[PDB]
C-alpha cells in the first residue's frame, strides 16, 4: 500500500518505507524499563 515494509519486534517497531509521499519511517522503541522512544522524524540511522 503506497510502498510499505513494516517490521515488528519484541516491544519495539521499526519502520523504513518511503510511502508514496508520507514516509512511514519512524522506529519506535518501547524500553519497558522506563523509556519510550517514538521519534517519527528524529535522529535515526537507517541503512540497507
Amino acid at each position: 500500500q503506497d510502498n510499505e515494509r513494516v517490521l515488528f519486534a519484541p516491544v519495539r517497531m521499526v519502520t523504513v518505507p518511503p510511502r508514496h509521499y508520507c514516509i512511514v519511517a519512524n522506529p519506535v522503541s518501547r524500553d519497558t524499563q522506563s523509556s519510550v522512544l517514538f521519534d517519527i522524524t528524529g535522529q535515526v540511522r537507517l541503512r540497507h
Binding site: P18, G42, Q43, L46, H48
Partner: protein
C-alpha cells in the same frame, strides 16, 4: 538533529555517509558528543581529538570547527610557542 537515511541499490547509494579522511574537530561541552564505538562524552572543556568517524560535518553543529586531511610533508618543520592572552 536530522535523519540521514542511506539506502543501497546498484553501485550507487543515496541518502535522503562516509568516513572523514583524517579529519578532526574541537570537542567541548556546548551540546554533547557521542560515538557508536564505545566511549562517549556528555560534558567537557576544551579538548580536540582525531581518528575514528561516522559523523557528518553538519553545517548546524560540527562541535566547534572542522579540519580535514593531513598537510605537512616530510621537510616541513614546525616551532610552537607557549601562548596566553590579556
Amino acid at each position: 538533529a536530522d535523519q540521514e537515511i542511506r539506502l543501497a541499490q546498484d553501485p550507487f547509494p543515496l541518502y535522503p555517509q562516509v568516513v572523514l579522511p583524517n579529519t578532526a574537530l574541537h570537542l567541548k561541552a556546548l551540546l554533547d558528543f557521542e560515538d557508536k564505538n564505545g566511549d562517549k562524552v556528555m560534558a567537557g572543556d576544551e579538548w580536540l581529538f582525531e581518528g575514528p568517524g561516522t559523523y557528518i560535518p553538519q553545517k548546524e553543529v560540527e562541535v566547534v570547527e572542522i579540519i580535514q586531511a593531513t598537510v605537512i610533508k616530510q621537510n616541513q618543520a614546525l616551532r610552537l610557542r607557549a601562548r596566553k592572552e590579556c
